[PDB]
Structures are given as C-alpha cells and as structure tokens.
mmCIF file of C-alpha atoms and ligand atoms in Angstrom:
data_model
loop_
_atom_site.group_PDB
_atom_site.id
_atom_site.type_symbol
_atom_site.label_atom_id
_atom_site.label_comp_id
_atom_site.label_asym_id
_atom_site.label_seq_id
_atom_site.Cartn_x
_atom_site.Cartn_y
_atom_site.Cartn_z
ATOM 1 C CA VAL A 1 -42.791 2.009 37.677
ATOM 2 C CA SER A 2 -39.546 1.452 39.605
ATOM 3 C CA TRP A 3 -36.203 1.252 37.827
ATOM 4 C CA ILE A 4 -36.058 -2.444 38.672
ATOM 5 C CA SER A 5 -39.564 -3.112 37.353
ATOM 6 C CA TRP A 6 -38.666 -1.125 34.235
ATOM 7 C CA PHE A 7 -35.399 -3.010 33.724
ATOM 8 C CA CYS A 8 -36.725 -6.538 34.181
ATOM 9 C CA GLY A 9 -39.455 -5.550 31.729
ATOM 10 C CA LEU A 10 -37.181 -4.701 28.807
ATOM 11 C CA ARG A 11 -36.869 -6.939 25.778
ATOM 12 C CA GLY A 12 -34.156 -9.485 26.505
ATOM 13 C CA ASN A 13 -34.332 -9.274 30.285
ATOM 14 C CA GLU A 14 -36.980 -11.986 30.584
ATOM 15 C CA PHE A 15 -34.498 -14.223 32.422
ATOM 16 C CA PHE A 16 -34.150 -11.716 35.250
ATOM 17 C CA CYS A 17 -36.394 -11.567 38.297
ATOM 18 C CA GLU A 18 -37.205 -8.449 40.348
ATOM 19 C CA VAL A 19 -34.883 -8.114 43.336
ATOM 20 C CA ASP A 20 -36.630 -7.053 46.565
ATOM 21 C CA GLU A 21 -35.767 -3.442 47.306
ATOM 22 C CA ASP A 22 -35.035 -4.260 50.955
ATOM 23 C CA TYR A 23 -32.465 -6.886 49.942
ATOM 24 C CA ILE A 24 -30.633 -4.164 48.059
ATOM 25 C CA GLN A 25 -31.028 -1.611 50.868
ATOM 26 C CA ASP A 26 -29.163 -3.861 53.301
ATOM 27 C CA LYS A 27 -25.529 -2.809 52.831
ATOM 28 C CA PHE A 28 -24.381 -6.221 54.077
ATOM 29 C CA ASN A 29 -25.789 -7.965 50.988
ATOM 30 C CA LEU A 30 -23.818 -5.805 48.571
ATOM 31 C CA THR A 31 -20.455 -6.016 50.359
ATOM 32 C CA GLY A 32 -17.816 -6.353 47.677
ATOM 33 C CA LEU A 33 -19.934 -5.261 44.737
ATOM 34 C CA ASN A 34 -19.191 -1.568 45.181
ATOM 35 C CA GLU A 35 -15.644 -2.083 43.999
ATOM 36 C CA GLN A 36 -16.592 -3.854 40.754
ATOM 37 C CA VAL A 37 -18.718 -1.229 39.053
ATOM 38 C CA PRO A 38 -17.864 2.387 38.185
ATOM 39 C CA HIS A 39 -19.970 5.184 39.688
ATOM 40 C CA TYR A 40 -21.163 2.679 42.297
ATOM 41 C CA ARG A 41 -22.828 5.432 44.327
ATOM 42 C CA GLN A 42 -24.920 7.000 41.570
ATOM 43 C CA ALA A 43 -25.620 3.589 40.025
ATOM 44 C CA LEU A 44 -26.969 2.153 43.272
ATOM 45 C CA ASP A 45 -29.049 5.304 43.614
ATOM 46 C CA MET A 46 -30.546 4.831 40.165
ATOM 47 C CA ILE A 47 -31.490 1.224 40.943
ATOM 48 C CA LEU A 48 -33.262 2.339 44.113
ATOM 49 C CA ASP A 49 -34.943 5.356 42.499
ATOM 50 C CA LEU A 50 -33.302 8.177 44.450
ATOM 51 C CA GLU A 51 -32.524 11.809 43.635
ATOM 52 C CA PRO A 52 -29.985 11.638 40.734
ATOM 53 C CA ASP A 53 -27.175 13.953 41.855
ATOM 54 C CA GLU A 54 -26.638 17.689 41.522
ATOM 55 C CA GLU A 55 -25.610 17.846 37.851
ATOM 56 C CA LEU A 56 -24.260 21.291 36.956
ATOM 57 C CA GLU A 57 -22.827 23.001 33.849
ATOM 58 C CA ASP A 58 -20.473 21.836 31.061
ATOM 59 C CA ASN A 59 -19.616 18.980 33.390
ATOM 60 C CA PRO A 60 -19.780 16.271 30.690
ATOM 61 C CA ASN A 61 -22.982 14.277 31.301
ATOM 62 C CA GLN A 62 -21.334 10.833 31.658
ATOM 63 C CA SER A 63 -24.976 9.944 32.253
ATOM 64 C CA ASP A 64 -25.069 6.870 30.003
ATOM 65 C CA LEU A 65 -21.965 5.557 31.761
ATOM 66 C CA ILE A 66 -23.936 5.532 35.001
ATOM 67 C CA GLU A 67 -26.912 3.830 33.402
ATOM 68 C CA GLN A 68 -24.604 1.101 32.239
ATOM 69 C CA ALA A 69 -23.102 0.867 35.739
ATOM 70 C CA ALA A 70 -26.569 0.416 37.247
ATOM 71 C CA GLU A 71 -27.152 -2.324 34.715
ATOM 72 C CA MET A 72 -23.957 -4.149 35.695
ATOM 73 C CA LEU A 73 -24.535 -3.599 39.391
ATOM 74 C CA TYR A 74 -28.107 -4.864 39.183
ATOM 75 C CA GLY A 75 -26.793 -7.966 37.462
ATOM 76 C CA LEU A 76 -24.203 -8.737 40.134
ATOM 77 C CA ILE A 77 -26.864 -8.242 42.801
ATOM 78 C CA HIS A 78 -29.232 -10.495 40.867
ATOM 79 C CA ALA A 79 -26.586 -13.215 40.886
ATOM 80 C CA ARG A 80 -26.337 -13.177 44.664
ATOM 81 C CA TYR A 81 -30.075 -12.689 45.097
ATOM 82 C CA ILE A 82 -31.207 -15.796 43.208
ATOM 83 C CA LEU A 83 -29.248 -18.000 45.621
ATOM 84 C CA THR A 84 -31.319 -16.818 48.574
ATOM 85 C CA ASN A 85 -34.529 -18.660 49.365
ATOM 86 C CA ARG A 86 -36.552 -15.621 48.299
ATOM 87 C CA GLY A 87 -34.791 -15.189 44.961
ATOM 88 C CA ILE A 88 -35.015 -18.924 44.272
ATOM 89 C CA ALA A 89 -38.716 -18.742 45.013
ATOM 90 C CA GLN A 90 -39.154 -16.077 42.323
ATOM 91 C CA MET A 91 -37.049 -17.902 39.745
ATOM 92 C CA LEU A 92 -38.909 -21.125 40.467
ATOM 93 C CA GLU A 93 -42.014 -19.170 39.551
ATOM 94 C CA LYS A 94 -40.674 -18.115 36.136
ATOM 95 C CA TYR A 95 -39.397 -21.678 35.729
ATOM 96 C CA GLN A 96 -42.939 -22.986 36.063
ATOM 97 C CA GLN A 97 -44.011 -20.460 33.410
ATOM 98 C CA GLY A 98 -41.394 -21.641 30.906
ATOM 99 C CA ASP A 99 -39.895 -18.136 31.088
ATOM 100 C CA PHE A 100 -36.467 -19.501 30.251
ATOM 101 C CA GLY A 101 -37.436 -21.652 27.273
ATOM 102 C CA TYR A 102 -37.623 -25.383 26.682
ATOM 103 C CA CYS A 103 -34.944 -27.930 25.935
ATOM 104 C CA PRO A 104 -34.492 -28.363 22.176
ATOM 105 C CA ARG A 105 -33.601 -32.095 22.461
ATOM 106 C CA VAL A 106 -36.422 -34.056 20.915
ATOM 107 C CA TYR A 107 -36.289 -36.605 23.734
ATOM 108 C CA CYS A 108 -36.209 -34.023 26.534
ATOM 109 C CA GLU A 109 -39.804 -33.329 25.389
ATOM 110 C CA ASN A 110 -39.831 -29.561 25.995
ATOM 111 C CA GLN A 111 -38.405 -29.760 29.496
ATOM 112 C CA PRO A 112 -38.309 -26.204 30.806
ATOM 113 C CA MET A 113 -34.778 -24.901 31.398
ATOM 114 C CA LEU A 114 -33.056 -22.663 33.940
ATOM 115 C CA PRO A 115 -30.645 -19.852 33.077
ATOM 116 C CA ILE A 116 -27.022 -20.490 33.951
ATOM 117 C CA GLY A 117 -23.631 -18.893 33.514
ATOM 118 C CA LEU A 118 -20.530 -20.629 32.220
ATOM 119 C CA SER A 119 -18.506 -18.217 34.356
ATOM 120 C CA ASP A 120 -18.958 -15.923 37.346
ATOM 121 C CA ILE A 121 -16.610 -13.313 35.924
ATOM 122 C CA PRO A 122 -18.454 -10.514 34.102
ATOM 123 C CA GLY A 123 -17.567 -10.256 30.416
ATOM 124 C CA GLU A 124 -16.561 -13.919 30.148
ATOM 125 C CA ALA A 125 -19.603 -15.464 28.469
ATOM 126 C CA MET A 126 -23.249 -14.699 27.774
ATOM 127 C CA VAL A 127 -26.072 -16.480 29.601
ATOM 128 C CA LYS A 128 -26.825 -20.083 28.646
ATOM 129 C CA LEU A 129 -29.684 -22.458 29.365
ATOM 130 C CA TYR A 130 -29.468 -25.602 31.462
ATOM 131 C CA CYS A 131 -31.901 -28.464 30.889
ATOM 132 C CA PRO A 132 -32.323 -30.387 34.140
ATOM 133 C CA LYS A 133 -33.400 -33.538 32.282
ATOM 134 C CA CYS A 134 -30.499 -34.172 29.861
ATOM 135 C CA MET A 135 -28.346 -32.023 32.165
ATOM 136 C CA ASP A 136 -26.677 -30.169 29.284
ATOM 137 C CA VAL A 137 -26.121 -26.498 28.441
ATOM 138 C CA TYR A 138 -27.677 -24.737 25.435
ATOM 139 C CA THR A 139 -27.512 -21.370 23.691
ATOM 140 C CA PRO A 140 -30.827 -19.443 23.805
ATOM 141 C CA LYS A 141 -32.772 -19.742 20.544
ATOM 142 C CA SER A 142 -33.547 -15.995 20.521
ATOM 143 C CA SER A 143 -30.801 -13.548 19.623
ATOM 144 C CA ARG A 144 -32.463 -11.123 22.017
ATOM 145 C CA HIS A 145 -30.680 -12.974 24.833
ATOM 146 C CA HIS A 146 -27.227 -13.043 23.263
ATOM 147 C CA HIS A 147 -26.056 -9.955 25.112
ATOM 148 C CA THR A 148 -27.044 -10.858 28.635
ATOM 149 C CA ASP A 149 -23.937 -11.654 30.663
ATOM 150 C CA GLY A 150 -24.124 -15.082 32.275
ATOM 151 C CA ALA A 151 -22.337 -13.828 35.366
ATOM 152 C CA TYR A 152 -25.648 -12.256 36.348
ATOM 153 C CA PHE A 153 -26.978 -15.778 36.874
ATOM 154 C CA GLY A 154 -23.887 -17.606 38.108
ATOM 155 C CA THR A 155 -22.568 -21.115 37.605
ATOM 156 C CA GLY A 156 -24.298 -22.594 40.585
ATOM 157 C CA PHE A 157 -27.825 -21.236 40.334
ATOM 158 C CA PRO A 158 -29.541 -24.251 38.727
ATOM 159 C CA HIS A 159 -27.826 -26.490 41.288
ATOM 160 C CA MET A 160 -28.962 -24.298 44.154
ATOM 161 C CA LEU A 161 -32.576 -24.307 42.997
ATOM 162 C CA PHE A 162 -32.847 -28.071 42.854
ATOM 163 C CA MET A 163 -31.014 -28.299 46.200
ATOM 164 C CA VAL A 164 -33.799 -26.220 47.757
ATOM 165 C CA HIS A 165 -36.562 -27.783 45.650
ATOM 166 C CA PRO A 166 -35.596 -31.449 45.087
ATOM 167 C CA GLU A 167 -39.213 -32.160 44.190
ATOM 168 C CA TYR A 168 -38.815 -30.353 40.836
ATOM 169 C CA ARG A 169 -35.809 -32.377 39.626
ATOM 170 C CA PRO A 170 -36.731 -34.686 36.656
ATOM 171 C CA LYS A 171 -36.987 -38.346 37.656
ATOM 172 C CA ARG A 172 -34.950 -40.942 35.780
ATOM 173 C CA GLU B 1 -41.505 -18.630 -15.516
ATOM 174 C CA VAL B 2 -40.000 -20.332 -12.464
ATOM 175 C CA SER B 3 -40.534 -24.108 -12.434
ATOM 176 C CA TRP B 4 -42.943 -25.673 -9.946
ATOM 177 C CA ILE B 5 -39.968 -27.201 -8.186
ATOM 178 C CA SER B 6 -38.090 -23.905 -8.017
ATOM 179 C CA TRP B 7 -41.282 -22.263 -6.775
ATOM 180 C CA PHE B 8 -41.899 -24.943 -4.136
ATOM 181 C CA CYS B 9 -38.399 -25.069 -2.694
ATOM 182 C CA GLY B 10 -38.606 -21.290 -2.487
ATOM 183 C CA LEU B 11 -41.664 -21.084 -0.220
ATOM 184 C CA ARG B 12 -41.383 -20.131 3.441
ATOM 185 C CA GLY B 13 -40.689 -23.248 5.452
ATOM 186 C CA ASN B 14 -39.252 -25.298 2.591
ATOM 187 C CA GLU B 15 -35.687 -24.125 3.203
ATOM 188 C CA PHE B 16 -34.641 -27.670 4.145
ATOM 189 C CA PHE B 17 -35.574 -29.000 0.703
ATOM 190 C CA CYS B 18 -33.255 -29.040 -2.277
ATOM 191 C CA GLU B 19 -34.261 -28.851 -5.949
ATOM 192 C CA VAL B 20 -34.601 -32.315 -7.477
ATOM 193 C CA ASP B 21 -33.134 -32.616 -11.000
ATOM 194 C CA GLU B 22 -35.962 -32.795 -13.511
ATOM 195 C CA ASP B 23 -34.304 -35.734 -15.313
ATOM 196 C CA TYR B 24 -34.193 -37.769 -12.085
ATOM 197 C CA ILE B 25 -37.951 -37.370 -11.867
ATOM 198 C CA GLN B 26 -38.488 -38.069 -15.570
ATOM 199 C CA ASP B 27 -36.895 -41.506 -15.232
ATOM 200 C CA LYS B 28 -39.866 -43.750 -14.341
ATOM 201 C CA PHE B 29 -37.496 -46.230 -12.688
ATOM 202 C CA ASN B 30 -36.657 -43.758 -9.898
ATOM 203 C CA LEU B 31 -40.294 -43.305 -8.904
ATOM 204 C CA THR B 32 -41.270 -46.971 -8.913
ATOM 205 C CA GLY B 33 -43.560 -47.491 -5.952
ATOM 206 C CA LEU B 34 -44.364 -43.848 -5.284
ATOM 207 C CA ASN B 35 -47.320 -43.770 -7.697
ATOM 208 C CA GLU B 36 -49.345 -45.902 -5.315
ATOM 209 C CA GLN B 37 -48.816 -43.722 -2.236
ATOM 210 C CA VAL B 38 -50.249 -40.411 -3.415
ATOM 211 C CA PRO B 39 -53.725 -39.645 -4.809
ATOM 212 C CA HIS B 40 -54.024 -38.226 -8.342
ATOM 213 C CA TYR B 41 -50.483 -39.465 -8.973
ATOM 214 C CA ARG B 42 -50.782 -38.701 -12.683
ATOM 215 C CA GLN B 43 -51.878 -35.077 -12.432
ATOM 216 C CA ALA B 44 -49.606 -34.497 -9.440
ATOM 217 C CA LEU B 45 -46.507 -35.724 -11.258
ATOM 218 C CA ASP B 46 -47.542 -33.552 -14.195
ATOM 219 C CA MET B 47 -47.760 -30.487 -11.979
ATOM 220 C CA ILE B 48 -44.276 -31.134 -10.551
ATOM 221 C CA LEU B 49 -42.841 -31.360 -14.067
ATOM 222 C CA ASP B 50 -44.787 -28.375 -15.407
ATOM 223 C CA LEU B 51 -46.999 -30.083 -17.986
ATOM 224 C CA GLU B 52 -50.417 -29.259 -19.457
ATOM 225 C CA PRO B 53 -52.894 -29.720 -16.563
ATOM 226 C CA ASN B 54 -62.599 -27.105 -6.750
ATOM 227 C CA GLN B 55 -60.558 -30.327 -6.772
ATOM 228 C CA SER B 56 -57.647 -28.016 -7.591
ATOM 229 C CA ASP B 57 -56.190 -27.447 -4.119
ATOM 230 C CA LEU B 58 -56.335 -31.208 -3.514
ATOM 231 C CA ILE B 59 -53.975 -31.702 -6.443
ATOM 232 C CA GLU B 60 -51.627 -28.969 -5.255
ATOM 233 C CA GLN B 61 -51.565 -30.870 -1.959
ATOM 234 C CA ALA B 62 -50.762 -34.064 -3.796
ATOM 235 C CA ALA B 63 -47.905 -32.495 -5.742
ATOM 236 C CA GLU B 64 -46.528 -31.277 -2.413
ATOM 237 C CA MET B 65 -46.633 -34.761 -0.901
ATOM 238 C CA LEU B 66 -45.312 -36.402 -4.042
ATOM 239 C CA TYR B 67 -42.419 -33.949 -4.330
ATOM 240 C CA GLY B 68 -41.557 -34.752 -0.742
ATOM 241 C CA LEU B 69 -41.467 -38.505 -1.271
ATOM 242 C CA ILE B 70 -39.305 -38.014 -4.364
ATOM 243 C CA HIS B 71 -37.061 -35.676 -2.373
ATOM 244 C CA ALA B 72 -36.546 -38.412 0.204
ATOM 245 C CA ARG B 73 -35.212 -40.867 -2.353
ATOM 246 C CA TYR B 74 -33.380 -38.171 -4.301
ATOM 247 C CA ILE B 75 -31.150 -37.051 -1.410
ATOM 248 C CA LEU B 76 -29.756 -40.581 -1.073
ATOM 249 C CA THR B 77 -28.345 -40.485 -4.601
ATOM 250 C CA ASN B 78 -24.873 -39.071 -5.116
ATOM 251 C CA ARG B 79 -26.332 -36.072 -6.927
ATOM 252 C CA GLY B 80 -28.896 -35.269 -4.224
ATOM 253 C CA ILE B 81 -26.313 -35.718 -1.499
ATOM 254 C CA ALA B 82 -24.058 -33.318 -3.375
ATOM 255 C CA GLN B 83 -26.767 -30.639 -3.291
ATOM 256 C CA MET B 84 -27.580 -31.183 0.378
ATOM 257 C CA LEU B 85 -23.892 -31.121 1.251
ATOM 258 C CA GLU B 86 -23.893 -27.688 -0.359
ATOM 259 C CA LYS B 87 -26.715 -26.346 1.856
ATOM 260 C CA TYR B 88 -24.982 -28.030 4.791
ATOM 261 C CA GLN B 89 -21.873 -25.959 4.168
ATOM 262 C CA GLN B 90 -24.078 -22.842 4.121
ATOM 263 C CA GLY B 91 -25.660 -23.650 7.500
ATOM 264 C CA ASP B 92 -29.004 -23.902 5.679
ATOM 265 C CA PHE B 93 -30.280 -26.326 8.291
ATOM 266 C CA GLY B 94 -29.262 -24.417 11.381
ATOM 267 C CA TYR B 95 -26.651 -24.971 14.055
ATOM 268 C CA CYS B 96 -26.573 -27.251 17.075
ATOM 269 C CA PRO B 97 -27.900 -25.471 20.185
ATOM 270 C CA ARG B 98 -25.601 -27.307 22.571
ATOM 271 C CA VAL B 99 -23.137 -24.792 23.937
ATOM 272 C CA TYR B 100 -20.311 -27.308 23.587
ATOM 273 C CA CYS B 101 -21.175 -28.345 20.021
ATOM 274 C CA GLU B 102 -20.055 -24.790 19.147
ATOM 275 C CA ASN B 103 -22.560 -24.043 16.385
ATOM 276 C CA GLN B 104 -21.952 -27.274 14.522
ATOM 277 C CA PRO B 105 -24.132 -27.155 11.412
ATOM 278 C CA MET B 106 -26.845 -29.824 11.412
ATOM 279 C CA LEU B 107 -28.541 -32.000 8.794
ATOM 280 C CA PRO B 108 -32.309 -32.479 8.478
ATOM 281 C CA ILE B 109 -33.572 -35.913 9.474
ATOM 282 C CA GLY B 110 -36.843 -37.756 9.910
ATOM 283 C CA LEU B 111 -37.803 -39.784 12.958
ATOM 284 C CA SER B 112 -39.940 -41.917 10.645
ATOM 285 C CA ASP B 113 -40.235 -42.753 6.955
ATOM 286 C CA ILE B 114 -44.019 -42.925 7.109
ATOM 287 C CA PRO B 115 -45.676 -39.673 6.048
ATOM 288 C CA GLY B 116 -47.761 -38.072 8.780
ATOM 289 C CA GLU B 117 -45.754 -39.669 11.595
ATOM 290 C CA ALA B 118 -43.557 -36.774 12.710
ATOM 291 C CA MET B 119 -42.269 -33.425 11.507
ATOM 292 C CA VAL B 120 -38.680 -32.890 10.359
ATOM 293 C CA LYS B 121 -35.965 -32.742 13.014
ATOM 294 C CA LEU B 122 -32.308 -31.705 13.037
ATOM 295 C CA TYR B 123 -29.366 -34.026 13.569
ATOM 296 C CA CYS B 124 -26.096 -32.634 14.919
ATOM 297 C CA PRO B 125 -23.245 -34.813 13.688
ATOM 298 C CA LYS B 126 -21.025 -33.768 16.627
ATOM 299 C CA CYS B 127 -23.111 -34.658 19.683
ATOM 300 C CA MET B 128 -25.037 -37.057 17.456
ATOM 301 C CA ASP B 129 -28.427 -36.085 18.877
ATOM 302 C CA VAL B 130 -31.732 -34.932 17.402
ATOM 303 C CA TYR B 131 -33.284 -31.488 17.930
ATOM 304 C CA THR B 132 -36.469 -29.623 17.088
ATOM 305 C CA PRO B 133 -35.994 -26.678 14.695
ATOM 306 C CA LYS B 134 -35.843 -23.324 16.535
ATOM 307 C CA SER B 135 -38.135 -21.702 13.957
ATOM 308 C CA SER B 136 -41.831 -22.528 13.971
ATOM 309 C CA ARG B 137 -41.800 -22.060 10.207
ATOM 310 C CA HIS B 138 -40.383 -25.591 9.992
ATOM 311 C CA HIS B 139 -42.915 -27.231 12.296
ATOM 312 C CA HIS B 140 -45.148 -28.383 9.462
ATOM 313 C CA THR B 141 -42.597 -30.057 7.220
ATOM 314 C CA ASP B 142 -43.022 -33.819 7.338
ATOM 315 C CA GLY B 143 -39.825 -35.610 8.291
ATOM 316 C CA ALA B 144 -40.600 -38.437 5.898
ATOM 317 C CA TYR B 145 -39.490 -36.121 3.111
ATOM 318 C CA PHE B 146 -35.947 -36.418 4.483
ATOM 319 C CA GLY B 147 -35.884 -39.959 5.807
ATOM 320 C CA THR B 148 -34.277 -41.617 8.803
ATOM 321 C CA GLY B 149 -31.095 -42.530 7.015
ATOM 322 C CA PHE B 150 -30.174 -39.375 5.136
ATOM 323 C CA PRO B 151 -27.601 -37.942 7.574
ATOM 324 C CA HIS B 152 -25.854 -41.260 7.734
ATOM 325 C CA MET B 153 -25.868 -41.645 3.975
ATOM 326 C CA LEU B 154 -24.238 -38.254 3.559
ATOM 327 C CA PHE B 155 -21.384 -39.016 5.907
ATOM 328 C CA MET B 156 -20.744 -42.454 4.396
ATOM 329 C CA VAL B 157 -20.336 -40.742 0.998
ATOM 330 C CA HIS B 158 -18.414 -37.826 2.517
ATOM 331 C CA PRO B 159 -16.485 -39.219 5.519
ATOM 332 C CA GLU B 160 -14.269 -36.150 5.388
ATOM 333 C CA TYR B 161 -17.047 -33.945 6.759
ATOM 334 C CA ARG B 162 -17.414 -36.099 9.931
ATOM 335 C CA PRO B 163 -16.743 -33.639 12.835
ATOM 336 C CA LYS B 164 -13.983 -34.337 15.269
ATOM 337 C CA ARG B 165 -16.029 -34.626 18.479
HETATM 338 ZN ZN1 LIG C 201 -32.600 -31.478 27.685
HETATM 339 ZN ZN1 LIG C 202 -24.607 -31.168 18.603
#
C-alpha cells in the first residue's frame, strides 16, 4: 500500500482523508508549501512513493527527520485539498460515517461533527471538533487525536463543506 | 472485609458515586419514603449495612437500586456535598469537552429523578450545559441516583467554587 494509504490508516489519523496522487503531482497545487517543511524534496518523494535518494556512508541517516517532514507536508497539502470539491466530497463521506465523532451535548443528540483547526499556523493548536448543530468547538474524546495538528484541517473547512453542501446543514 | 458500600462504590462504572456514611443510613428518618420504592426493602437495606442475610441476584439488584436512591438524598446534605466537592476537586467526574470551557471539571447530574428514565449526565458549571460521559463504562448508571438538583445544591452551599465564565 501507498505511503498515503499507509499514513491515513495509522491510529490517530482517522480524521484525514486520502489525497489524490494527481492533486499532489500538480506543482501548482503545492506552490508555497515547499518553503515550510525541511527536506521538501525527499519528503514529497516519500509521499509519492519514489526512489528514496542515494544514501551513502557515515552520512548521518537524518532519515526520521524526513519522515517527519513528509508527515508535515502531507498535512499542509491535506488542508488545501479538503477545500476542493473533490476533497470535500471525501470528507463528506467520512462525515456520513461518523468518522469524526459525535457531539457530546445531550441535546445535540449525537450530531456528527467535522474536524476543524483553531489556527492555520502549524504548531499552534491540535485539531478540534465542530458540531454543526450547536455550532461549538470540542476537544476529541480520544487521546489518540491529541497530537494531530489542527492546521492540517484549517479554520474554514467546516464552513466550506456546508457552503458546497447546504443540504447537510442542521435545520433549526 | 470491605463494607458493601466500599465494595459497591469501588466497582467499574460507579466512580461517580461517593460513600454514604453508615450512620446517615442507620437513621430511619433519612430513608422515610424509600422503603416503598424498592422490592425486598428489608433484606436490601440489610445487605447495604452488612447484616446477617436463586432469588439472590434479585436482592443484590435491589441493594444497588436502594443504595442509589439513598445516594441521591445523601449528596444534598452538607456531609454528602462535602464528599462530592472532594471528588469534584479531583476531576472525578471528568472535564467539559468544550474547547473554550478549558477542561472545567464537571458535576454528575440527572435529567430526571425517576429511576429508569435516563442515565447519568455531566453538568459543566462554566458553559452551564449537560453532556454525555465520554466513557461507555458510565452509560448504565441511572441519573436518578444523582438527581436533577445536585449541581445547584453544591454551588449554593459552596458559592466560592462557581467558575468565572
Ligand atoms: Zn453540538
Ligand atoms: Zn462547559
């Protein structure tokens, strides 16, 4: 399985959706990201499953540092991706599956929530959950999601989704 | 040798309960009215107080219901409230999930005082709303064992713990 499929499958990455390879392959979609993550070249290669460099001698491995970079880069791409009609389509799918959890308010009656970020700057805050019914923001019940940066989901995702799919917005 | 009460409050899922003072239970005046709500009231009250005892499990079930009803009244008394306030300070009931409530500890609360109506819920004193416990281990604890007015009783007796919202 692809790096992306492998990543989105890990424990804690349930909120993520699989970004279409072609979206990533189009340089125009990643403009600006390459200057936010270290080892951008090797990291983007790892995400797309390509020959992982030469790698010769004592040359300290710095391997893990690249794995982390791929992780950050995938996140930033994810953020942009889920604003596009295709990404939104995929998230809407998970939404229908309750992939993001249900609102804990007793009166929201288990309204499924959408992931959301309190900030678009990486390292600011971890991902939170937005209930479209009571329109408030909650902390995920599972600690497994307490290390997922919210910037990988953005502050305007939930808004975008309902803008494109008004029919799913809770009534009254 | 652990007392029935100590044993009960120690079971998985009964973390929201506090241990009712034996003497409170021994005073007949405090239980007036309860004896006509649970079956086998005599044997059940005996089991709760650790006294000389197929219909067995049915009595264990009765002691469980009876302890709950007593708990409900108990936590309205200054002594019960004191104990609950303790657990409250330990975050024994959990913290509010609202991101902006900033992990405000919550108090248990019932949506109804009638047994069998609804399971126990959590009241955040900051956003003043009611939530369902994150852990499924608490999804079988009747809310009637905590009452609809407990949280409000606690803060009337301890206004100083009223969060600045
Ligand atoms: Zn809600
Ligand atoms: Zn709250």
